[PDB]
Write a protein that binds this DNA or RNA. Sequence first.
DNA 1: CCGCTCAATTGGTCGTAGACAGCTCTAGCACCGCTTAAACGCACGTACGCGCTGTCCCCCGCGTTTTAACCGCCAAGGGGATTACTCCCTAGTCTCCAG
DNA 2: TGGAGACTAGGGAGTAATCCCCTTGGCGGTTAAAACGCGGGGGACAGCGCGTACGTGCGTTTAAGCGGTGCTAGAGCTGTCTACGACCAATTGAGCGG
Lengths: 74, 73, 69, 71, 302, 15, 75, 90, 76, 88
Amino acid sequence: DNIQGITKPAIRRLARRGGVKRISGLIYEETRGVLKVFLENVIRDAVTYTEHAKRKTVTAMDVVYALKRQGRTL
Amino acid sequence: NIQGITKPAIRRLARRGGVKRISGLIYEETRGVLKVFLENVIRDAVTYTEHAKRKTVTAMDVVYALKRQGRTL
Amino acid sequence: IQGITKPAIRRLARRGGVKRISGLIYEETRGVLKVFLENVIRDAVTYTEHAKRKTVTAMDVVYALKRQG
Amino acid sequence: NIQGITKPAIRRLARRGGVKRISGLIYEETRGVLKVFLENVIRDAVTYTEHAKRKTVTAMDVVYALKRQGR
Amino acid sequence: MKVITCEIAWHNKEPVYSLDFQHGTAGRIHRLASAGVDTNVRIWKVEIVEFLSNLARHTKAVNVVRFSPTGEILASGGDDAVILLWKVKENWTVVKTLRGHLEDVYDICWATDGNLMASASVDNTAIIWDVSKGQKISIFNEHKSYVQGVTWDQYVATLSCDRVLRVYSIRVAFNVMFHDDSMKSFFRRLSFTPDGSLLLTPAGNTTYVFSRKNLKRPIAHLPCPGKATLAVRCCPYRLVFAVASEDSVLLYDTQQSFPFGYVSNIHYHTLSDISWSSDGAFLAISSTDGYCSFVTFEKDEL
Amino acid sequence: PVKIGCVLQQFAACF
Amino acid sequence: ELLIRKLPFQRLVREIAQDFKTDLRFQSSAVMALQEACEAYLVGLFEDTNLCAIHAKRVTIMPKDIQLARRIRGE
Amino acid sequence: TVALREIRRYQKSTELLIRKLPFQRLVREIAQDFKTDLRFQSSAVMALQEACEAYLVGLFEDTNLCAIHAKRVTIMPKDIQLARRIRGER
Amino acid sequence: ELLIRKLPFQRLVREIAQDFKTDLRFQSSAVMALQEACEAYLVGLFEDTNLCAIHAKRVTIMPKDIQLARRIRGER
Amino acid sequence: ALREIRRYQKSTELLIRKLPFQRLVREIAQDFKTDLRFQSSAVMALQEACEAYLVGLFEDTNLCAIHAKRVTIMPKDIQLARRIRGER
DNA sequence: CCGCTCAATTGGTCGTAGACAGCTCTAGCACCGCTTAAACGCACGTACGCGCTGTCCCCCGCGTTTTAACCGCCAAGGGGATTACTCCCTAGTCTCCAG
DNA sequence: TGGAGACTAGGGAGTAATCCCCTTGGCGGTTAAAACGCGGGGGACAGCGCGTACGTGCGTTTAAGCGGTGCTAGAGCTGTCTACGACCAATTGAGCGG
């Protein structure tokens, strides 16, 4: 349930910063799921870049290259 | 010193940038713009680190400094 | 858009410090002007929908300049 | 000119796309969006051809441009 | 008390942001420091205002201007997140650049000995730097919102927009009341007593007074019905201080609980700052409408 | 301009 | 398997080439490559805009749908 | 009016929306889930959280565009499905 | 003073606003401020393109200089 | 030369050498104030962003040069591209 | 592949008629996301013992890339002839600003 | 409701862009090496984070509630995919010339 640790008002504020007005009460599990999916999709690339560098920990730069592969460098 | 940025380094960097022929003193000149860009990005990065009350600079403060510059990559 | 007249642009240029001016620049900067109002008013209407009104304000254009720079 | 990609061609392309019903303004904004998709890909193809000193445009340049686009 | 309204625009109709009177001068002729939205710092002589020097070192608008107790080092705070240390119709040369702020600097405080600088910025952090070394020496980033007030006494007082007052030992010592960001002013500079026994906190409407013994609970609070207080300034036993509201200026004394004098309906915009001179006989008061006015009074209670 | 000399009850102190 | 007819697209690519630069060379293989690429892209665009329409309780597709799909694609 | 107020507050602001250690613990769960004995540098956690923030804000803006095109103000997970599919994700 | 006459500017902003949505009136202050900012942008870009033209050691502006300036600025 | 632009434009690897860029970053931090730890991740980020800045500036100065009917690129183009971007 | 013709027929397309399937608008209904009140609870900071993960600089191993002097040759450039294009009124007009 | 500054049309030409022609420099291989760059092994001193105890309070959580909204049924107009007769560009069949 720690995936649900991303609170309902937290998701609400996140969506609002994107410019939303009214949020359906049943979208929360869906956005939790999509967030988990995206997080897996980027943590995998981070992990492979750490392993290729023969690294036993992951630093901030690795996730940048992971997003670079994803296509949302930031 | 700044001479660490080698002449072939500028050569190949500009070549990836797409130049067919490079002038002769642009090597000595572009180390100046390298100096200027460094003395800005690193300058703001170390202030971001100090604001975080840590004595070790990390990539996140660096990309935040780039965000402030507006050249995030 | 033709309402942006030739010598209005011309003394804009004279303020800009130019001496000799071409011909195609007139409708060229007409087009770039068009794009400028499109993205400025894009941001303005984005903040107007956020504001739930129908009349733009000076704060909207101030934010347009802040977002364009 | 742009009108060469005609109305029935877009019609049958839509039929192959699976959409049952089609409006009119689509017939020309599709032309606009197709010219948009074309000008950048031709631009980049011309870049790689001049970049490799090729007046003739090979299919390898086309697939490289498509890979750059993502299609 | 005589009030004279200056009809001239100090910086070509730019908004009013900060003032600073030369404390080092011990004579009748006073020097005024004027840095505003014009991205330039103009030095004027007041005795009648005559412009003396203009410095355009600041790349952006300057929000806070202040000088050291000796009057020789002038620190200018601007929106470029840099504080320029100025040294000696007049010539001004920047001596040091006290960088270290992540956002625009709002309030600037000095030290009595002149060896330390206290800065406040919109980065929700306090910057303390040593004048001798010119580098930051202590940081207090306990502010959760914009920091718009800081002063140096043994203790350092920091006030932020989060409706919390922070006092730090030269680590945070005490936390203390205020309102939200609805105030239209950009300065909430708290003022300490000349002896340091008392601390004044505006934007509470009322202004609270705390003592050195206990700063957690203020014994008395001076109300500001209508307009809210923005800046507090004390003339450099009995002491006379001044608190500036949004559009009103009141002067209080150490003995009289009620205000000694009240001035209002002078400017059409929100007030920016409050500041007295070294001799206390010159105090020009204005708001952020782009103009200036002067308030003069004798009877100096030497 | 409105000015009151160095002598307001409406602006009293409330403890 | 191709749906857009050949010589109209041949002339189209030739004319955009000339509007870019005069006297350009285009083999038949390159034109078929452009043909399959544009066909795939436009078929995908129509498919996705059809999803966009069928979301809106609507069978037909009108221009708001297509600009929405493009704007979501970010191009 | 509350929504307009907080939009004015937030669209200028850039601080966090999902809290620090909840996201950090979620990162821990997924890390040990796929392969255990990995250490996450807190700077990397902040980086990944910022990336997640941006991705979700972009996706929510796109589903808002979808909703506006659909003529309704309230969002619906159908809109989320459309946004994901039109973007080519899922 | 300003170097662009008004009601052409108000009529053009009216028509574009119309093509986005119907019934968005403006007050004189907003249109005047936006006209000021627009003139400032145009004059700045014009000085920039003037410097670019003199870079090519020809005093006369040409329209290629315009999009060169825009693209170096990263406008498009 | 065009083959050489191809071989690097295809590639992504660093163009500035590792050790002397690292030393340049170290000395630049030195003259600000001493006793700084530079995690090699941050130096990698600096190298990435610095190479990106230079490739972008060189693309723009190439645009400026080809504008001037010159294939070569000179300092004049360098300062003009720096200014036009708004840096100076 | 050009680039262009000289014909055949030949599928491919264009404009017309309109019936109605469907976009758009109206409206009511129920319903289900926004809202303090209050509970809680776990963010969140603060310190702190414990640990291990950047790390260090030395050497050396080597060895690939960088320095640089040489040399052919490509263009940056300066000049001059040539053709095109805004100045400078001249006047109509138009219309925007004024009373 | 009116008329003076100004936009449009145009003659005038005179300056400025544009193209070609040396022309001299100075920039691009390149060869010999070397030398500083890449790697890799240690010591643990000194720095960072992990985890934990406690606070405290700013946040989440529940709810009762009601009203803006999603939508669902019902028209009202409307443009469009039916069929068709017309054009109509034009692929194939052939080239010369390269």
